[PDB]
Ligand SMILES: CN1C(=O)c2ccccc2[C@@H]1O
């Protein structure tokens with residue numbers, strides 16, 4: 001089997017991407033944030049505290065003929081941005097892009113934090129990291145990918161995120177028309193439950209490539225590119241007037257600037273992030289200070305290749321017995 005679904009930016013900045021997902025029978029279509037940095041499929045639901053729902057589409061387990069309580073199971077998750085959610089668990093049929101899994105754990109939110117409530121465009125998350133991170137207790141559950149894997153034509157999924165445009169998530173096949181050149185594969189460590197890999201270095205604009213190992217995660221659920229402070233300082237030093245602002249919470253730059261590109265290494269290959277991808281626009285409405293898309297990881301504990309980096313590439317998440325990542329230009 002295979003599946004193929006279009007993923008669409010939630011706003012003009014590409015802050016996140018939503019992908020329609022069919023849950024239940026008859027289908028209830030929710031727009032979920034596919035997150036390769038977490039492992040829970042959770043949704044706004046009829047159980048979600050009413051004051052915490054503001055415009056989201058909800059999943060109603062009772063209105064689904066295939067919805068079965070996973071008795072005793074609870075979940076609770078906290079993300080890198082300080083957001084959180086928790087609740088109970090139903091198994092139900094879940095389809096993505098024509099690919100169906102029966103008996104998928106659908107984690108129904110009883111509570112969500114303010115950042116979820118305030119974003120009407122995201123109806124929940126679909127985690128695509130390794131199932132060792134799933135938060136369901138007392139019986140950990142599998143991700144949609146892990147449940148689909150044995151049925152897929154190839155044990156893979158691909159992320160092809162757009163810059164200010166829709167893109168695609170494919171399951172079970174690598175679409176050889178979607179990228180240019182060849183795909184460079186690189187080793188993955190699953191020790192922390194993430195798609196963790198080591199970049200071979202970076203360049204800023206037209207500058208020389210710096211060969212250096214940067215260990216980080218491929219995380220579709222993180223907007224920005226978070227790298228070591230040395231790397232980030234080297235980038236923003238090439239933008240006149242850029243500075244780190246503790247008041248704003250990262251590097252800002254004059255909205256009048258033209259940003260340099262940023263290159264990262266994948267083995268001997270190179271992915272170039274155009275300068276425009278690194279613009280996240282005014283810090284507040286009408287400001288002439290703009291927020292940077294490359295930020296320091298120093299206050300995180302991990303480097304994160306988020307959407308700023310991933311949307312410059314066609315990315316293969318190879319879930320074979322020994323997982324690997326692949327990157328191609330596009
Ligand atoms: C035991 N229960 C189920 O299996 C179920 C399914 C859908 C809604 C509600 C319920 C109920 O709580």
Ligand code: NA
Pocket residue numbers: 291
């Ligand atoms: Na921000």
